[PDB]
Design a protein around this nucleic acid. Structure first.
Ligand SMILES: [Mg+2]
Ligand SMILES: [Mg+2]
Ligand SMILES: [Mg+2]
Ligand SMILES: [Mg+2]
Ligand SMILES: [Mg+2]
Ligand SMILES: [Mg+2]
Ligand SMILES: [Mg+2]
Ligand SMILES: [Mg+2]
Ligand SMILES: [Mg+2]
Ligand SMILES: [Mg+2]
Ligand SMILES: [Mg+2]
Ligand SMILES: [Mg+2]
Ligand SMILES: [Mg+2]
Ligand SMILES: [Mg+2]
Ligand SMILES: [Mg+2]
Ligand SMILES: [Mg+2]
Ligand SMILES: [Mg+2]
Ligand SMILES: [Mg+2]
Ligand SMILES: [Mg+2]
Ligand SMILES: [Mg+2]
Ligand SMILES: [Mg+2]
Ligand SMILES: [Mg+2]
Ligand SMILES: [Mg+2]
Ligand SMILES: [Mg+2]
Ligand SMILES: [Mg+2]
Ligand SMILES: [Mg+2]
Ligand SMILES: [Mg+2]
Ligand SMILES: [Mg+2]
Ligand SMILES: [Mg+2]
Ligand SMILES: [Mg+2]
Ligand SMILES: [Mg+2]
Ligand SMILES: [Mg+2]
Ligand SMILES: [Mg+2]
Ligand SMILES: [Mg+2]
Ligand SMILES: [Mg+2]
Ligand SMILES: [Mg+2]
Ligand SMILES: [Mg+2]
Ligand SMILES: [Mg+2]
Ligand SMILES: [Mg+2]
Ligand SMILES: [Mg+2]
Ligand SMILES: [Mg+2]
Ligand SMILES: [Mg+2]
Ligand SMILES: [Mg+2]
Ligand SMILES: [Mg+2]
Ligand SMILES: [Mg+2]
Ligand SMILES: [Mg+2]
Ligand SMILES: [Mg+2]
Ligand SMILES: [Mg+2]
Ligand SMILES: [Mg+2]
Ligand SMILES: [Mg+2]
Ligand SMILES: [Mg+2]
Ligand SMILES: [Mg+2]
Lengths: 229, 185, 148, 53, 124, 51, 157
RNA sequence: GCCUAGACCGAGGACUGCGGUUUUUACCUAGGAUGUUGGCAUAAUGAUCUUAAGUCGCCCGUCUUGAAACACGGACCAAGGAGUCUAACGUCUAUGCGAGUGUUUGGGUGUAAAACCCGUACGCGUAAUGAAAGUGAACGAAGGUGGGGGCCCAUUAGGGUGCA
RNA sequence: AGCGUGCUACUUAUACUUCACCGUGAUUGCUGUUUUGACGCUUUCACGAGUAGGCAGGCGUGGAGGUCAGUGACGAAGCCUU
């Protein structure tokens, strides 16, 4: 009778007590990691601000380090695409409109983005934009399936061998482009954003410089993602 | 819309069940579907796939093949597993004492396995004495010896067998098979 | 059964699987083996080379009974010994007393030499033998006795 | 490059340290400071149109 | 829902899928036929043409085959046919065949009330 | 069965990011920076106004 | 429909609902709803009647009186969403509304002697405070209606 | 960080998970809607049919690069109406036996064209090649090398055995 | 309410985002609780245009072996009918 139902409930209660006690330490670890990430973000910002101010004082010019990360959104449909940009868009895992992916800037990937430039809008994402993307529309590829990032255990079970134990570990790994950026960005399913609230410009399919939407907008990608996520 | 990187709605292309409606083969699949799902033993996963194969994909294993497989170093007391029919070979000079598990045995094969002190058991008896296929050895028959394979991939300078009803000097031997009659391919 | 044929599934579709342009005309390309040297050269040359031409000499009134000579190899020769006495013969055979195997009476004309014999003397009566078949028979201490 | 990678691997091993042999694409450049002593910026403007024929 | 509880029953299409030009010609019956013509306005799905049957209109598997009262309907031809609905009186209802005589029909109705089986066509 | 936004659900936010509690408690989102009131552009950076 | 028999594995047991985690939390009333406020009823029998708001019942309803002598609106409940909360207020600190609750308005034409007595006791204090504001009794005794050119999105009440 | 207006939705169905608050089965907003009130059951509610209104909708079938076409057949309706069967075959699948295989030409038998039983021959296969006269398949564990599922010994790794 | 140009808001496709349902493909697990369905049940994800054409799963018809000891002159079959 309920003997067994209550028995398995008591066994579950004991096992869950032990599991929660063990997980408490891991959660302390990820808490500490997130605090450290915040400290280093703030420290880096103040260091860069101070360096700019110092260069201003000493009759010099501080040249920023070129950005190492970009967020690329395919804003063009799937019809009438030449084979090479089509293959390039497939290789960025941008196989639908309003699909977004994180790309680490080098030469190979830069020439890739240049090839896909007439069909994408991309830019340099801020930390809050990355956090908002991963929190609301962050999905992982688990056994070729699109799984919501609803618990830190999914991230641990798939990226603990890369020292990613939390959603903030993943966010830090994306933002400050880390030694395991490849694994973290390929594990991330391409973000499937909505259309912008407020629309695009009057005509999308022209460079951002000429009043369109394609190409590099750099810091306005954060506003665009805010519109679309 | 999606720019598809692979063909959509594609079946795996592997048999997941026998085409046969034999109720007794189904029972054998019943047993190894449970074993492959629950033993972590790679042997049981191979047997489950092999029970699905079609007639041409499970060629007969002669009693001579088993004799040569038992002649491997350190394989004399292994259990021979044949998912199919074991046939006799009257060209053997001698047969050892062996334990053999097969779907079917021919009259000569069962006669020659038991005459030499061996056992001829079915595949369900194997699953009790070797539920993980411990100390087993799977033997497969020749697939490329079929007559139909003779004509596969036929072409010029391919050396395959022509699809022909009669054989002789008057049947597809003159022009294109001979340099004295034009060319030879 | 007609209920299993694909003719039943094309009912309701206009062209019945024959194409709307190509259709199912009477005999496009000819009848039978027509055009084998002109527009069906690509078929006969690729898949049936040697089709056209004459090779060899004719044989007026060829009687295949003349050429009857079924072959038996050495690895199948001991199957002609009586099954109930095979094991006894394999033990007590010597030069003084070996089993006699009349191959012609089993329907064979020539003994060929594929495979290996037991190292046991046998007396083989045959119409024809190959050079290696008799060498292998003599090596196990046997002999070939010609018959007709 | 095979020999150079082999040479790099052995010497880091001699020092009991590690070395990375995978090639990398060109990365974006780091931060830097531009001195303006003797190099105060000169202001340019687009030039008017002329015919030289 | 006097039957076993079920989700709200959804019928994706409540009209009858009528064959194209079954209204223009008497020889063309309303039984649905898919247009195969090269120029067909219906086969090419022009705006304003008739709806056509497709698997998207399929009924929810939890409300599929249920009459408005929430029961699955089973055809009964004699009193012994009610024996298969003994343990499903809250999920299966019986419908009496039209060719059962007026005598046997009263007998079938009588046994269903004793067993608690609901009857879908009670007057005829 | 139903994805919940951690940016809307505070409980889910703390489930995913335990440091969010400290972030909220310390007002990290409105933290002041302590520095002096200075203006370092008085010299040659006035080359921006004219040249 | 057809001749498909029910199977043995087709059970008839009804599963229990899952344990719901919709623990109720208290209602949030509008800031304009303060006891003593003059309200306008938008629906019901007494639609258009200006009435006095007295108490917030545990049913999420508002206890309301006309007063009945001035208005014809007795002690009853109204819903806060069918009410326009004006800015006029009456001092109701001298009115005891402790005994009024849901069980008072329980459904059992004939009117209870208790209910009539309670009407008089509440209305005495209501009238005493109403007399202080000139034209307040006349305002309460008059029905409310929308005149031509009245825009409720611009008016303050 | 905080307050605030509206809309749509409520899939799931004992428990199990992660958190949070711990008020250590104490709860919670934390693996998907509950609570409460009114009304209706001669009905509020829902479907179909007809019809009006709004909006969209060119005649199907065919050959065709292109058909609503000023391209052809079709006034209407009912019934009939078009990839069949056979001889010989290729691929694939199932079945029986298996170095053999096929009872059915025939013979036995019968409750009589069935079913049941029988065997010699023969066909194909078990040997190829050469125009033919003719000859006719083990150097070796019926070979070596690189892989190779599975199995054996191990102990990341590693070693052994390795059918197709 | 034309031409060149800039700005704010707004309109709506079978497109995109979240959710529901149908089907297809894959996927998690299911026998000392397998329990009269394992050709079954179940968890999860992604996808759905189509002439000629291929394949699959079904609907219907004349007749046949078996079964419902089935329906039926107390009305079979046929036919008309919001
Ligand atoms: Mg990427
Ligand atoms: Mg966690
Ligand atoms: Mg808007
Ligand atoms: Mg705009
Ligand atoms: Mg536009
Ligand atoms: Mg425009
Ligand atoms: Mg511009
Ligand atoms: Mg938005
Ligand atoms: Mg789609
Ligand atoms: Mg894809
Ligand atoms: Mg081979
Ligand atoms: Mg052959
Ligand atoms: Mg010549
Ligand atoms: Mg049919
Ligand atoms: Mg078809
Ligand atoms: Mg078609
Ligand atoms: Mg037609
Ligand atoms: Mg066809
Ligand atoms: Mg045609
Ligand atoms: Mg053709
Ligand atoms: Mg010619
Ligand atoms: Mg010859
Ligand atoms: Mg319908
Ligand atoms: Mg038609
Ligand atoms: Mg046309
Ligand atoms: Mg067309
Ligand atoms: Mg009738
Ligand atoms: Mg009055
Ligand atoms: Mg529900
Ligand atoms: Mg009430
Ligand atoms: Mg109309
Ligand atoms: Mg035509
Ligand atoms: Mg033509
Ligand atoms: Mg065409
Ligand atoms: Mg033309
Ligand atoms: Mg014209
Ligand atoms: Mg024409
Ligand atoms: Mg014509
Ligand atoms: Mg005409
Ligand atoms: Mg006519
Ligand atoms: Mg007419
Ligand atoms: Mg055939
Ligand atoms: Mg017969
Ligand atoms: Mg013969
Ligand atoms: Mg024979
Ligand atoms: Mg090897
Ligand atoms: Mg203008
Ligand atoms: Mg859709
Ligand atoms: Mg389709
Ligand atoms: Mg039939
Ligand atoms: Mg007929
Ligand atoms: Mg019958």
């Amino acid at each position: 009778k309920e003997k067994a139902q209550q028995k398995t409930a008591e066994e579950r209660a004991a096992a869950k007590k032990v599991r929660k006690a063990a997980n408490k330490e891991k959660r302390k670890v990820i808490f500490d990691r997130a605090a450290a990430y915040q400290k280093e973000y703030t420290e880096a910002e103040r260091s860069v601000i101070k360096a700019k101010r110092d260069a201003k004082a000493s009759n010099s010019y501080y040249v920023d380090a070129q950005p190492k990360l970009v967020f690329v959104v395919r804003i063009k449909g799937i019809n009438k695409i030449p084979p090479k940009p089509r293959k390039v868009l497939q290789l960025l895992r941008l196989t639908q409109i309003n699909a977004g992916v994180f790309v680490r800037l080098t030469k190979a990937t830069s020439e890739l983005i240049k090839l896909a430039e007439p069909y994408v809008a991309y830019g340099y994402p801020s930390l809050s934009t990355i956090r908002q993307l991963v929190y609301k529309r962050g999905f992982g590829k688990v056994n070729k399936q699109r799984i919501a990032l609803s618990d830190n255990a999914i991230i641990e079970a798939n990226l603990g061998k890369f020292n990613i134990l939390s959603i903030e570990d993943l966010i830090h790994e994306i933002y400050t482009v880390g030694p395991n950026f490849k694994q973290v960005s390929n594990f991330l399913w391409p973000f499937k954003l909505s259309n912008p609230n407020g629309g695009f410009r009057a005509r999308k399919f022209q460079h951002f410089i000429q009043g369109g939407d394609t190409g590099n907008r750099e810091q306005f990608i954060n506003a665009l993602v805010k519109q679309m996520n | 819309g999606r720019d598809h990187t692979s063909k959509q709605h594609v079946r795996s292309g592997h048999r997941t069940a026998p085409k046969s409606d034999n109720v007794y083969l189904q029972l054998l699949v019943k047993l190894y579907s449970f074993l492959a799902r629950r033993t972590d033993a790679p042997f049981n996963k191979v047997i489950l796939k092999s029970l699905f194969l079609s007639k041409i994909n499970r060629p007969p294993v002669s009693v001579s093949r088993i004799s040569r497989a038992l002649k491997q170093k350190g394989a004399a007391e292994k259990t021979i597993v044949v998912v199919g029919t074991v046939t006799d070979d009257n060209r053997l000079l001698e047969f050892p004492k062996a334990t053999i598990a097969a779907l079917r045995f021919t009259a000569g094969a069962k006669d020659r396995i038991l005459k030499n002190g061996g056992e001829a058991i079915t595949l369900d008896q194997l699953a009790l004495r070797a539920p993980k296929g411990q100390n087993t050895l799977i033997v497969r028959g020749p697939r490329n010896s079929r007559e139909a394979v003779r004509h596969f991939g036929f072409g010029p300078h391919k050396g395959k067998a022509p699809r022909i009803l009669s054989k002789g000097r008057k049947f597809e031997r003159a022009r294109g098979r001979r340099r004295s009659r034009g060319f030879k391919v | 059964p007609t209920r299993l044929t694909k003719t039943r599934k094309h009912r309701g579709n206009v062209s019945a699987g024959k194409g709307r342009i190509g259709k199912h005309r009477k005999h496009p390309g000819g009848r039978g083996k027509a055009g084998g040297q002109h527009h069906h050269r690509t078929n006969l040359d690729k898949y049936h080379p040697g089709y056209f031409g004459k090779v060899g000499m004719r044989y007026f009134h060829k009687q295949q009974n003349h050429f009857w000579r079924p072959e038996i190899n050495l690895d199948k020769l001991w199957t002609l010994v009586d099954s109930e006495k095979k094991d006894e013969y394999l033990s007590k055979s010597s030069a003084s007393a070996a089993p006699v195997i009349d191959t012609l009476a089993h329907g064979y004309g020539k003994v060929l030499g594929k495979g290996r014999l037991p190292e046991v003397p046998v007396i083989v009566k045959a119409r024809f033998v190959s050079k290696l078949a008799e060498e292998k028979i003599r090596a196990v201490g046997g002999v070939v006795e010609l018959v007709a | 490059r095979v020999k150079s990678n082999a040479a790099k691997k052995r010497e880091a091993k001699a020092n009991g340290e590690t070395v990375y042999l995978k090639r990398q694409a060109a990365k974006p450049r780091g931060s830097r400071i531009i001195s303006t002593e003797g190099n105060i910026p000169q202001t340019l403007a687009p030039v008017a149109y002329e015919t030289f024929i | 829902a006097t039957s076993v509880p079920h989700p709200k029953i959804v019928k994706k299409y409540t009209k009858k899928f009528k064959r194209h030009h079954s209204d223009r010609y008497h020889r063309v019956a309303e039984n649905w036929r898919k247009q195969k013509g090269i120029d067909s306005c219906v086969r090419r799905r022009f705006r304003g043409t008739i709806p056509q049957p497709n698997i998207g209109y399929g009924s929810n598997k939890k409300t599929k085959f249920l009459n408005p009262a929430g029961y699955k309907v089973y055809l009964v031809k004699n009193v012994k046919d009610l024996d298969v609905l003994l343990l499903h009186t809250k999920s299966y209802a019986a419908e009496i065949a039209s060719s059962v005589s007026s005598r046997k029909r009263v007998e079938i109705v009588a046994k269903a009330k004793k067993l608690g089986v609901k009857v879908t066509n009670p007057k005829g | 069965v139903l994805k919940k936004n951690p940016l809307k659900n505070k409980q889910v936010l703390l489930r995913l990011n335990p440091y969010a509690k400290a972030y909220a408690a310390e007002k990290v989102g409105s933290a002041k920076v302590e520095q002096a009131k200075v203006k370092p552009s008085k010299g040659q950076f006035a080359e921006v106004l004219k040249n | 429909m057809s001749q498909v028999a029910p199977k043995w594995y087709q059970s008839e047991d009804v599963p229990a609902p899952k344990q719901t985690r919709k623990t109720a939390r208290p209602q949030k009333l509008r800031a304009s709803l303060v006891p003593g406020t003059v309200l306008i009823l938008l629906a019901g029998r007494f639609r258009g009647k200006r009435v006095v708001y007295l108490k917030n019942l545990e049913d999420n309803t508002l206890l309301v009186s006309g007063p009945f002598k001035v208005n014809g609106v007795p002690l009853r409940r109204v819903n806060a969403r069918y009410v326009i909360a004006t800015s006029t207020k009456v001092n109701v600190s001298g009115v005891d509304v402790s005994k009024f609750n849901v069980e008072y308005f329980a459904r059992e034409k004939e009117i209870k002697a208790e209910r009539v007595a309670d009407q008089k006791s509440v209305d005495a204090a209501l009238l005493s405070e109403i007399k202080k504001t000139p034209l307040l009794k006349q305002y309460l005794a008059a029905s409310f209606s929308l005149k031509n050119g009245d825009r409720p999105h611009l008016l303050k009440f």
